[PDB]
Amino acid sequence: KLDSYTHLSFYEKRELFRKKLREIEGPEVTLVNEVDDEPCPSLDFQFISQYRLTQGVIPPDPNFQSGCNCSSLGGCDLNNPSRCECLDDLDEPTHFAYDAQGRVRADTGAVIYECNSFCSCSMECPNRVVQRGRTLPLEIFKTKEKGWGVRSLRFAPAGTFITCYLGEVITSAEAAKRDKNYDDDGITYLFDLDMFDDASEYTVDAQNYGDVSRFFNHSCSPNIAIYSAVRNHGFRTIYDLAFFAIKDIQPLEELTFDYAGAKDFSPVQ
Ligand code: NI
Ligand SMILES: [Zn+2]
Ligand SMILES: [Zn+2]
Ligand SMILES: [Zn+2]
């Protein structure tokens, strides 16, 4: 029932959005809508691949970073949990967060310690998974009862990294400033960085800048969950929000999460 002008307008709007995704550095990201005639999600936002810092936020200084030099040939050898200085932040059931497959081990907690730029290992160091980025080709699609969602296009073994939740790092102060502006917003892309000390009170907002994950939906039976991966082991005022698959993800399966913090990880209870 759309008239020529509108129909063309929508056409062009969807194509613009597809253009925008083509410019994402990484595996493919596609846009589909088999439900209605909505072109695509709002274009008023920019895809990024690194946090965008904002006024008033003091980022962890890299200058005071610890760098492991336990890089023999390959990476750091996942058999030497007692050689890395990236792991010195805790010694109990000591081990690298990942296995050989690059998947997140089942005995790994809600905290991942990856190698820094101050380490001597190459980018292939088995302890630089998150840093390497997405590897799964994803598709933004229109769900029937919920807004837009994202499903995988490939099978993902539980424990597979997916992507970090990117966006502007704002102080819980301005956070609330924006909360005073959220009108009839169906979704409010806020993510508090309070895994540790609550003094920093920093939050990630993907309202205007973010990653594909800014399209992920909440759910009760999620297939992905946040893993606080840190590189500046000494200052966790800011860290990476990593999404890993908690269970096998079937191709074309929608990805969903529900942050519970370290209050769903370490407890079988
Ligand atoms: Ni089409
Ligand atoms: Zn190491
Ligand atoms: Zn290291
Ligand atoms: Zn390393």
mmCIF file of C-alpha atoms in Angstrom, residues 136-247:
data_model
loop_
_atom_site.group_PDB
_atom_site.id
_atom_site.type_symbol
_atom_site.label_atom_id
_atom_site.label_comp_id
_atom_site.label_asym_id
_atom_site.label_seq_id
_atom_site.Cartn_x
_atom_site.Cartn_y
_atom_site.Cartn_z
ATOM 1 C CA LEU A 136 31.147 -14.904 13.479
ATOM 2 C CA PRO A 137 29.130 -13.496 10.584
ATOM 3 C CA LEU A 138 25.942 -12.078 12.133
ATOM 4 C CA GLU A 139 22.576 -10.935 10.844
ATOM 5 C CA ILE A 140 20.394 -8.113 12.167
ATOM 6 C CA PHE A 141 16.787 -9.200 11.690
ATOM 7 C CA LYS A 142 13.270 -8.129 12.609
ATOM 8 C CA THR A 143 11.673 -10.318 15.260
ATOM 9 C CA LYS A 144 7.914 -10.596 15.323
ATOM 10 C CA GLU A 145 7.048 -9.333 18.806
ATOM 11 C CA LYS A 146 10.313 -7.694 19.797
ATOM 12 C CA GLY A 147 12.160 -5.066 17.821
ATOM 13 C CA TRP A 148 15.216 -5.944 15.809
ATOM 14 C CA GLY A 149 17.451 -8.760 16.935
ATOM 15 C CA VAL A 150 20.642 -10.483 15.886
ATOM 16 C CA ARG A 151 21.103 -14.174 15.157
ATOM 17 C CA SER A 152 24.189 -16.038 14.139
ATOM 18 C CA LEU A 153 24.700 -17.235 10.581
ATOM 19 C CA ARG A 154 27.019 -20.052 11.658
ATOM 20 C CA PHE A 155 27.018 -22.715 14.347
ATOM 21 C CA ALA A 156 28.801 -21.531 17.475
ATOM 22 C CA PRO A 157 30.186 -23.980 20.062
ATOM 23 C CA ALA A 158 29.352 -23.010 23.627
ATOM 24 C CA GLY A 159 32.343 -21.079 24.919
ATOM 25 C CA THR A 160 32.924 -19.203 21.652
ATOM 26 C CA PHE A 161 33.687 -15.480 21.816
ATOM 27 C CA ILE A 162 31.180 -13.299 20.024
ATOM 28 C CA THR A 163 31.829 -9.606 20.527
ATOM 29 C CA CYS A 164 32.251 -6.866 23.103
ATOM 30 C CA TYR A 165 29.572 -4.397 24.065
ATOM 31 C CA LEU A 166 31.039 -1.135 22.747
ATOM 32 C CA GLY A 167 29.939 2.463 23.174
ATOM 33 C CA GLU A 168 30.613 5.771 24.914
ATOM 34 C CA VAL A 169 32.080 5.486 28.387
ATOM 35 C CA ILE A 170 30.184 7.996 30.492
ATOM 36 C CA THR A 171 30.288 8.757 34.217
ATOM 37 C CA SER A 172 27.280 7.590 36.239
ATOM 38 C CA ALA A 173 26.698 11.296 36.614
ATOM 39 C CA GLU A 174 25.966 12.152 32.967
ATOM 40 C CA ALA A 175 24.439 8.685 32.807
ATOM 41 C CA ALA A 176 21.573 10.011 34.902
ATOM 42 C CA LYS A 177 21.637 13.236 32.869
ATOM 43 C CA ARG A 178 20.726 11.119 29.861
ATOM 44 C CA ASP A 179 18.214 9.130 31.930
ATOM 45 C CA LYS A 180 16.409 12.453 32.283
ATOM 46 C CA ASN A 181 16.278 12.623 28.497
ATOM 47 C CA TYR A 182 15.161 9.070 27.659
ATOM 48 C CA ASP A 183 11.630 9.686 26.403
ATOM 49 C CA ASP A 184 9.491 6.951 24.792
ATOM 50 C CA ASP A 185 12.659 4.925 24.222
ATOM 51 C CA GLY A 186 11.779 1.260 23.754
ATOM 52 C CA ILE A 187 15.393 0.401 24.510
ATOM 53 C CA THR A 188 17.959 2.206 26.691
ATOM 54 C CA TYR A 189 21.415 0.915 25.786
ATOM 55 C CA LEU A 190 23.066 1.364 29.220
ATOM 56 C CA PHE A 191 25.657 -0.982 30.714
ATOM 57 C CA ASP A 192 27.207 -0.276 34.124
ATOM 58 C CA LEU A 193 30.916 -1.106 34.575
ATOM 59 C CA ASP A 194 30.622 -2.062 38.243
ATOM 60 C CA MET A 195 32.160 -5.518 38.183
ATOM 61 C CA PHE A 196 34.656 -4.253 40.751
ATOM 62 C CA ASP A 197 34.924 -1.046 42.778
ATOM 63 C CA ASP A 198 31.836 1.144 42.609
ATOM 64 C CA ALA A 199 33.864 4.317 43.068
ATOM 65 C CA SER A 200 34.478 4.880 39.360
ATOM 66 C CA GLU A 201 30.790 4.401 38.573
ATOM 67 C CA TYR A 202 31.387 4.275 34.823
ATOM 68 C CA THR A 203 28.869 3.167 32.221
ATOM 69 C CA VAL A 204 28.854 2.219 28.554
ATOM 70 C CA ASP A 205 26.222 3.847 26.375
ATOM 71 C CA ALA A 206 25.671 2.647 22.799
ATOM 72 C CA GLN A 207 22.852 5.065 21.947
ATOM 73 C CA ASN A 208 25.062 6.843 19.393
ATOM 74 C CA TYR A 209 28.210 4.757 19.093
ATOM 75 C CA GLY A 210 28.489 1.013 19.431
ATOM 76 C CA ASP A 211 28.939 -2.452 17.990
ATOM 77 C CA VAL A 212 26.520 -4.883 16.361
ATOM 78 C CA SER A 213 25.804 -6.117 19.865
ATOM 79 C CA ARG A 214 23.860 -2.882 20.380
ATOM 80 C CA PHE A 215 21.092 -4.898 18.758
ATOM 81 C CA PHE A 216 21.206 -7.916 21.068
ATOM 82 C CA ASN A 217 17.974 -8.701 22.936
ATOM 83 C CA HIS A 218 17.410 -9.534 26.574
ATOM 84 C CA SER A 219 15.941 -12.885 27.532
ATOM 85 C CA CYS A 220 15.427 -15.322 30.383
ATOM 86 C CA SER A 221 17.158 -18.243 28.670
ATOM 87 C CA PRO A 222 20.173 -16.446 27.082
ATOM 88 C CA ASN A 223 22.786 -18.135 24.926
ATOM 89 C CA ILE A 224 25.515 -15.526 25.484
ATOM 90 C CA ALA A 225 26.885 -13.819 28.591
ATOM 91 C CA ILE A 226 29.226 -10.972 29.586
ATOM 92 C CA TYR A 227 32.813 -11.772 30.549
ATOM 93 C CA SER A 228 34.784 -8.908 32.104
ATOM 94 C CA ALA A 229 38.051 -9.172 30.204
ATOM 95 C CA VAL A 230 40.823 -6.896 31.466
ATOM 96 C CA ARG A 231 44.250 -5.952 30.132
ATOM 97 C CA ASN A 232 45.318 -3.204 32.559
ATOM 98 C CA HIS A 233 45.263 -5.748 35.399
ATOM 99 C CA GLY A 234 45.974 -2.963 37.879
ATOM 100 C CA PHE A 235 43.144 -0.543 37.103
ATOM 101 C CA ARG A 236 39.711 -2.013 36.418
ATOM 102 C CA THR A 237 37.888 1.316 36.301
ATOM 103 C CA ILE A 238 37.197 0.308 32.676
ATOM 104 C CA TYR A 239 37.360 -3.135 31.051
ATOM 105 C CA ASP A 240 35.933 -5.029 28.107
ATOM 106 C CA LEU A 241 32.377 -6.344 28.136
ATOM 107 C CA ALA A 242 32.783 -9.637 26.317
ATOM 108 C CA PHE A 243 29.974 -11.788 25.000
ATOM 109 C CA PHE A 244 30.738 -15.497 24.814
ATOM 110 C CA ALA A 245 28.330 -18.221 23.875
ATOM 111 C CA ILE A 246 27.223 -20.043 27.026
ATOM 112 C CA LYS A 247 25.634 -22.830 24.988
#
